[PDB]
Amino acid sequence: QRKRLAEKYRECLSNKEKILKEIEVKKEYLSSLQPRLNSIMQASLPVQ
């Protein structure tokens, strides 16, 4: 039972690490899409 509780705690820690990785991926995606939208607007303004 202690080994099963340790395995459940390791699975919960892996789920928390996956949630933190998803939050970091969302933050990096927003930080990259900010300059990407800036470059897309700068490219659209020359075509406009």
Partner: peptide, 28 residues
Amino acid sequence: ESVEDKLELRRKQFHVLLSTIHELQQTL
């Protein structure tokens, strides 16, 4: 007059898009 209204609507849409891009550049 219809073609001029469509061109003015396209120009106002382009100006609104430029203003939104300027607001996004000012916020970021």
